[PDB]
Write a protein that binds this ligand. Structure first.
Ligand SMILES: COC[C@H](C)Nc1ccc(NS(=O)(=O)N(C)C)c(Nc2ccc3nn[nH]c3c2)n1
Length: 110
């Protein structure tokens, strides 16, 4: 598996609306697949990280909000976007994992 995405970066500009923790974070019965980086070794998906070059997960997104990683909600929102999109790209419409994402994504467009 690659190193997980960074959640700490002292020389990054940080701050707010970052509401994205307190209401927007899903963390729900279909959350468990997304609470950590895809383990492509444990799932025996040797192609996952060959297809998915911007991996992202709510575990990373949680540690980021709590570490004051972000500058704006646009940044965090794009990460949520990336998480959902990744899942749709790697998979096929109407897969169990694709259903779980869509559920969360609907709660997320709320
Ligand atoms: C719906 O159940 C099917 C799913 C493919 N199984 C499964 C089992 C474990 C995880 N989580 S993990 O990679 O963190 N774990 C093995 C430690 C999981 N998550 C998962 C998360 C996103 C995915 N996108 N495509 N496939 C994905 C699978 N999915």
């Amino acid at each position: 598996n690659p190193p997980p995405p960074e959640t700490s970066n002292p020389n990054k500009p940080k701050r707010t609306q970052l509401y994205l923790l307190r209401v927007v974070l899903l963390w729900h019965q279909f959350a468990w697949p997304f609470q950590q980086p895809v383990d492509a070794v444990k799932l025996n998906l040797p192609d996952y990280y060959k297809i998915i070059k911007t991996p992202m997960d709510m575990g990373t997104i949680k540690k980021r909000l709590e570490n004051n990683y972000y500058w704006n909600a646009q940044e965090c929102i794009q990460d949520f976007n990336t998480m959902f999109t990744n899942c749709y790209i790697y998979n096929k419409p109407g897969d169990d994992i694709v259903l779980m994402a869509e559920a969360l994504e609907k709660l997320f467009l709320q």
